[PDB]
Design a protein around this nucleic acid. Structure first.
Ligand SMILES: [Mg+2]
Ligand code: NA
Ligand code: NA
Ligand code: NA
Length: 310
DNA sequence: CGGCAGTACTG
DNA sequence: CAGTACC
DNA sequence: GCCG
């Protein structure tokens, strides 16, 4: 990154817009931050700034300011509420609307939230694990969590396939959470296993809290046995076999890679979701038995998971 | 002017 | 439904 | 915020 003198300044703004709920502006900043950090040289001119996709007039100007006086005026006018809104929206289950409401009601600290705020069941769990959910785990711990789910699943049916995706599948050294995708080639046995599987992982003591307990998605909290262990976020998603390749791709990400893939699909009159690659104007699901087929049908060369970490 | 993703949950 | 979350 |  030859532009952290620009990037770290823009990240303050990006985050301020995000926690205040201006998600589109915050998206624009994030896309420019990525662009800025991947270019091969320091940006030196306004017309050089305009040259990179994702940097437009207003963002060009903002680099011009940093380029010179070494600072950005806008940064000194960010609402004093931003750090508190960030604090609050880092509670799992509380987003920008809840953070702003708590702020308006006068709360300023997690002690205020603990003592005075009305919390949903999910937010109480997020508050209880506030520090734990901000930490990343070493990838060897993600492996242990994956293999815990897999052995519990394969005990029920040995043909169940279980794959940790997210940053773990992209080869990263640490992971914020473990996303375990499960399917079955028979196209049928995947159905209605949560009953047994979640009971099994609960029996262990492995599952400590449930955030979402749905027909096809589980989101919750686990902890491995022994001393010195943290609570970790764990998602388990069960998918029909025919959707496995698109699910793998989506839940492997990264989020910005998926975003680029959806736009490319749109340019070709298709749609790409976690369930399928389709035509669009319902639409025709195209057959994608493997991740390679998704790339091929988009006219793209295959990228293994590790070079999707955008 | 307006999309920038579409679901799956929760209550 | 609005809000939040998944990548 | 960017871009078409
Ligand atoms: Mg993940
Ligand atoms: Na540009
Ligand atoms: Na949150
Ligand atoms: Na996850």
């Amino acid at each position: 990154n030859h532009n952290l003198h620009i990037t770290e300044k823009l990240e303050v703004l990006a985050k301020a817009y995000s926690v205040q709920g201006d998600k589109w502006r915050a998206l624009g900043y994030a896309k420019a931050i990525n662009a800025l950090k991947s270019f091969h040289k320091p940006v030196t001119s306004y017309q050089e700034a305009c040259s990179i996709p994702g940097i437009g007039k207003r963002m060009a100007e903002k680099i011009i300011e940093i380029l010179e006086s070494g600072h950005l005026r806008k940064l000194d006018h960010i609402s004093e509420s931003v750090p508190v809104l960030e604090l609050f929206s880092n509670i799992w289950g509380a987003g920008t609307k809840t953070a702003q409401m708590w702020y308006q009601q006068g709360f300023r600290s997690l002690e205020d939230i603990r003592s005075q705020a009305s919390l949903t069941t999910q937010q109480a769990i997020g508050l209880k694990h506030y520090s734990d959910f901000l930490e990343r785990m070493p990838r060897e711990e993600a492996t242990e969590i994956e293999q815990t789910v897999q052995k519990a699943a394969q005990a029920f049916n040995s043909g169940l396939l279980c794959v940790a995706c997210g940053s773990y599948r992209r080869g990263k050294a640490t992971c914020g959470d473990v996303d375990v995708l499960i399917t079955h080639p028979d196209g049928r046995s995947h159905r209605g296993i949560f009953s047994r599987l979640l009971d099994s992982l609960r029996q262990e003591g492995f599952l400590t809290d449930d955030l979402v307990k749905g027909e096809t998605k589980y989101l919750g909290v686990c902890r491995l046995p022994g001393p010195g262990r943290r609570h970790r976020r764990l998602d388990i998603i069960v998918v029909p076999y025919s959707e496995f390749a698109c699910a793998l791709l989506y839940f492997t990400g990264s989020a910005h890679f998926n975003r680029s893939m959806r736009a490319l699909a749109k340019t070709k009159g298709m749609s790409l979701s976690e369930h399928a690659l389709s035509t669009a104007v319902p639409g025709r699901v195209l057959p994608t038995p493997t991740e390679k087929d998704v790339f091929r049908l988009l006219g793209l060369p295959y990228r293994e998971p590790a070079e999707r970490d955008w």
